[PDB]
């Protein structure tokens, strides 16, 4: 939500390199494997029995991409997070009934995935900035609860 000038520039530079399809699919897939109570919300995606079935499921990849695209919007609108996610907040609370703690979980999973893809380039200082973004997004999606 509030970065320095150097921090925003670093956050944005990393985002240029993010493949929303590979990252999104991986992040969503890991969430479903590591915290398997989240699978209740995605009953319509079919077989989510085991890690192999999850990571190769086309509905997981497609929905992951959509999540990451929405994240990208937050990254490019850091001063207006609450307005950017107002409609999505409503959807998750009113229609889907997702506990807001799960937004922090997905945010952290995404950070772990970024770390996996970028390795040493994902420095302690850069992760620190990403933890700020992730928390900002989670807070903006919780606002209409």
């Amino acid at each position: 939500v509030q970065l320095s000038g150097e921090e925003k520039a670093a956050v944005l530079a990393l985002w240029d390199k993010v493949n929303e399809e590979e990252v999104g699919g991986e992040a969503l897939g890991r969430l479903l494997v590591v915290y398997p109570w989240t699978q209740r919300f995605f009953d319509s995606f079919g077989d989510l029995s085991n890690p192999g079935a999850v990571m190769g499921n086309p509905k997981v990849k497609a929905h992951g991409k959509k999540v990451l695209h929405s994240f990208g919007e937050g990254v490019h609108h850091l001063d207006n997070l609450k307005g950017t996610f107002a409609a999505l907040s409503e959807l998750h609370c009113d229609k889907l009934h997702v506990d807001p703690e799960n937004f922090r979980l997905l945010g952290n999973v995404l950070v772990v995935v970024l770390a996996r893809h970028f390795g040493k380039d994902f420095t302690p200082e850069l992760q620190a900035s990403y933890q700020k973004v992730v928390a900002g997004v989670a807070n903006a999606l919780a606002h209409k609860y």
Binding site: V111, V112, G119, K120, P124
Partner: protein, 140 residues
């Protein structure tokens, strides 16, 4: 750790960590301090700057203790009883901070072992770290 398959995954993953447990321990503490500044409060007596000798030394202690636990999965409460007392009775560490250090440790493992850090292994490592955290906060 808990189920047989998780114990297998955890012993296997940590064999790949090997002699680097101390280094990763220190890196994870650094990521923790920077990402979550509340945690610095527990370390007033440390030089917290990058490559600090104290952080390096303390990282080695954390890595050794996790190595301890991996070899004692069938009895974590016994193996880590000295540390339960230190963190809960003496230091009064807020349980939330264990979740934060766990996340930072997983992040550090992802950086250094990207091919070995598969979804199944990530899941077992998460359960293991949660089990260690419960033991260390068990006095609570």
């Amino acid at each position: 750790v808990l189920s047989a398959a998780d114990k297998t995954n955890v012993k296997a993953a940590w064999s790949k960590v090997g002699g680097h447990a101390g280094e990763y321990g220190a890196e994870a503490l650094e990521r923790m301090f920077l990402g979550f500044p509340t945690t610095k409060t527990y370390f007033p007596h440390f030089d917290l700057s990058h490559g600090s000798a104290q952080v390096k030394a303390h990282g080695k202690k954390v890595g050794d203790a996790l190595t301890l636990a991996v070899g004692h999965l069938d009895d974590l409460p016994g193996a880590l009883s000295d540390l339960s007392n230190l963190h809960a009775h003496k230091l009064r560490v807020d349980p939330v901070n264990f979740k934060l250090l766990s996340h930072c440790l997983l992040s550090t493992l992802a950086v250094h072992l990207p091919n070995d850090f598969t979804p199944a292994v990530h899941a077992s490592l998460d359960k293991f770290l949660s089990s260690v955290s419960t033991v260390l906060t068990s006095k609570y």
